[PDB]
Design a protein around this ligand. Structure first.
Ligand SMILES: CC(=O)N[C@@H]1[C@@H](O)[C@H](O)[C@@H](CO)O[C@H]1O
Ligand SMILES: CC(=O)N[C@@H]1[C@@H](O)[C@H](O)[C@@H](CO)O[C@H]1O
Lengths: 514, 516
């Protein structure tokens, strides 16, 4: 059960407003990012001190099930446990179901809205159901950003489309689908990251548009989701000069309170986007940030750089009259209302879809319909006489490439043998001139300063080398420039980078056990 | 367990079979569908009375789920095996990963007493964590003596280059694991140590006489037999001196004569995986299986066709080419082992952060390490000014490389930006000229045609580039060539490829805003 609010000490109350960051992996030494991800002693200590929630990245699903069990066992007040699963729990945690990125659904809506809505619906339902089963009760999604800028490095295919109505529908469908289970759902990133070429992880972006446009494009998904009863809204770190010329949205009273809590009438959790992000740490000190953000009306501080001193800063702000105890508890009340929703509810593996056919088919359907082509069928050759050239953003970021994955195995049956290189390395690579297939896995994500421009390196290569064809996985936006730069060579494209998206494409083109 | 005679001849036969499966809970997750039984097949074969399963892949948590699942379908408890040579964590992450056996041999050169005590800790921690996950059959230690520095498949998987060295370390590992109820397996009799040919690809030819075999190859295996190793796995090797017509796997002279009789091994005699090209190029799947049992094997590991093996056996019993009493002899020995294996529940039993365990791993890596000069430091540069060139065998085969791993992160802080490339791509890559650090993780393993040989391509790069240093992880065998061919470039070497090994070496060369 949940204890009455006023029974908390001012410190326990403040602590609730803080969400820290762990790893899915059980042990300290497995942590990929020890700078940002607390160890067990620090995590237990925080939870026993009343920390409000934990956001987890990394680990197999079976592990997260084990982590969240452990984490919850240290908590007197049940923890909000969040993970960013946009593409489905499978995106974050191997062993759960990964869906194709939202922009894939975007396609289907253009052509067939009634069906697109319904897929997003079960996209949300399944995401919501598997999450509960891993012990994750807070889904930070849907992304409601309207992507108007082909060059947007951070949002890109994470988005349901380029127009507000497309995004409105497909985003509320997802919320509707998840609403079938008890998990918080999160609209992000207010008031939309849609238009920039700049990534707020790297630096502070500025969207120039005025209030008229802002209500015309950026806002409606958000309006829709709030009327929808989305549980939480995560703002981005952005300069919105038409609303505030001083502060980024994270720190602005006019934005978080004036525009959002008041004008749009959002009664849920206003959540700062991660507070360790380059965009914001560059703007102000970690303590200025926490206090100013609460001032601005944020209910939840997501991943503050210094947690121990942040609580202390808020305590000191409260004594110096810069904030008041009542303010803190208004935030607790909202936190209670959401912790109330999550307490009503799955034991791993039970609830994971797995080999369940109905799910596998839904994933395959979405890929198929969202696909884009020129039909053409390419050449076959004898063993290792040809080259399957796989080009990826980073190799440490390419989990979708695994031994015997369709993108490798299939072109191999046909004589092309795989070479895997990073797009940044390619230009400096001297290729044997032999029939060659190029598959680029490239898309936008967090920590992408600018998108991939394979077109130049490719044209150089079409002249140097006998291209059979080029497959693009991930971002669509470079097709326009591909058809224009190289009409000669046929191309195929899919939104999915995953094994089953690979299988579909590669098939259409036509011994090791350990 | 039920009396041995309660089993139908079909179930007796079935106990002699161990099939391959993946740790991942679901079918679509299997990286090797051809060899790895889907969940339906696995359930059918188990209910038919199959002897055991061998698992590959999955995190440790994933695997505990799997094994619980598999034992539930079995009336006779299954042997469940994985090849955890390097610690359960080699296979299923989340469990403990030890540096490879050779690193223990390295220590043994200068300080045998420690090296033996460390090896025993490796054995005990490995048995302990295995039990935790539901893995009762540890296929290890490898007893091969690696004489041949060019040996592709064994390489650093061996505890060393001499019989006395392997016997000591190998038996320690055994005595360590003997603190828990698990089967230990010696591999791969009569030792895969000296060949340049990987038996996964082709049938190795072994020209050594009987005397040489007893001098080098065998003595480790005897030490383990007197030490009580529960099972002995045999290699597919043509040893004419022993059998003119058959590989070790299919030869009664070798398995029955040399192993069972001459060495008096009373445990499980296990074939090497029967899907390997070394054996399959030799005979049809059904001949292979019956000739295997003929020669005295108690366990048929991963027969290429399972259902067809059982038929083929039943038939040969009819024609009396095999014998029914001969099937129950092997079931006797399987009964003896299963008697033993009859734990604790995951995450309990997993060492995790236990500082004794973490220090053991760290000490091994640290005492096994090699560097050209007493101590040397590398220059530092401004951000993204220099090059960190990571060279690996295969990118899909390199799980020790993850985002922000020390090998990437540490040089990064000193201004060397990451570039990852496969050794096969390297000689064709024209390098930008900035001071460069090269780290190649290259080692012997299953499915290796030839040992990766960087010496030539490095030498070419060395003349064209301001090379700061070369670091090798894995196989030691090219260091002499490095030292001779590039005496002016400082080098560092470590047996381990994992985070902790990168961390150690890289830190020593000198003295991120990214969260997702
Ligand atoms: C614009 C953007 O990348 N937003 C993400 C947000 O979805 C996520 O929840 C959090 C980190 O977990 O902050 C950012 O990394
Ligand atoms: C020479 C060699 O490496 N043989 C390995 C053996 O180590 C392994 O235990 C077994 C089943 O996995 O068969 C082969 O893959």
């Amino acid at each position: 059960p949940l204890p009455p609010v006023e029974s908390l000490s001012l410190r326990q109350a403040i602590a609730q407003m803080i969400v820290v960051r762990g790893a899915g992996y059980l042990f300290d030494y497995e942590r990929p990012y020890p700078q940002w991800e607390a160890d067990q002693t620090t995590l237990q200590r925080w939870i026993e001190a009343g920390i409000g929630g934990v956001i987890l990245l990394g680990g197999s699903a079976a592990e997260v099930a084990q982590k969240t069990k452990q984490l919850q066992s240290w908590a007197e007040i049940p923890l909000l446990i969040a993970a960013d699963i946009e593409e489905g729990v499978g995106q974050r945690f191997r062993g759960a179901t990964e869906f194709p990125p939202p922009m894939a659904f975007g396609e289907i809506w253009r052509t067939d809205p009634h069906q697109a809505i319904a897929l997003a619906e079960t996209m949300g339902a399944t995401t919501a159901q598997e999450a509960l089963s891993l012990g994750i009760n807070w889904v930070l999604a849907p992304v409601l950003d309207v992507n108007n800028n082909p060059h947007n490095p951070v949002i890109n295919i994470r988005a349901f489309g380029e127009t507000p109505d497309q995004v409105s529908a497909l985003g509320t469908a997802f919320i509707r689908g998840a609403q079938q289970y008890a998990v918080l759902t999160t609209a992000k990133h207010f008031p939309g990251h849609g238009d920039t070429a700049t990534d707020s992880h790297l630096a502070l972006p500025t969207i120039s548009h005025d209030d008229t446009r802002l209500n015309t494009v950026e806002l409606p998904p958000f309006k829709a989701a709030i009327q929808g009863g989305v549980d939480a809204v995560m703002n981005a770190h952005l300069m919105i000069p038409a609303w505030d010329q001083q502060y980024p949205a994270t720190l602005s009273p006019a934005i978080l309170t004036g525009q959002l809590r008041h004008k749009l009438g959002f009664k849920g959790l206003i959540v700062t986007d991660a507070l360790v992000m380059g965009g914001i740490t560059q703007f102000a000190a970690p303590d200025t940030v926490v206090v100013q953000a609460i001032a601005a009306g944020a209910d939840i501080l997501l991943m503050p750089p210094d947690v121990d001193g942040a609580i202390i800063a808020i305590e000191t702000a409260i004594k110096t009259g810069q904030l008041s105890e009542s303010r803190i508890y208004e935030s607790v009340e909202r936190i209670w209302q959401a912790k109330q929703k999550i307490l009503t509810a799955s034991t791993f593996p039970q609830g994971i879809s797995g080999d369940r056919p109905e799910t596998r088919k839904t994933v395959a359907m979405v890929l198929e319909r969202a696909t884009k082509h020129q039909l053409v069928k390419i050449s076959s050759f004898p063993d290792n006489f040809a080259r399957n050239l796989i080009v990826v953003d980073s190799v440490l970021k390419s989990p979708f490439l695994r031994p015997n994955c369709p993108a490798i195995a299939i072109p191999q049956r046909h004589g092309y043998a795989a070479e895997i290189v990073e797009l940044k390395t390619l230009p400096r690579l001297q290729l044997e001139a032999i029939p060659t297939l190029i598959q680029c896995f490239l898309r936008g994500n967090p920590f992408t300063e600018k998108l991939a421009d394979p077109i130049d390196v490719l044209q150089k290569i079409a002249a140097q080398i006998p291209l059979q064809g080029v497959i693009f996985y991930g971002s669509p936006y470079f097709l326009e420039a591909l058809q224009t730069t190289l009409p000669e060579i046929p191309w195929w494209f899919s939104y999915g980078q995953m094994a089953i998206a690979q299988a579909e494409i590669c098939t259409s083109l036509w011994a090791e056990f350990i």
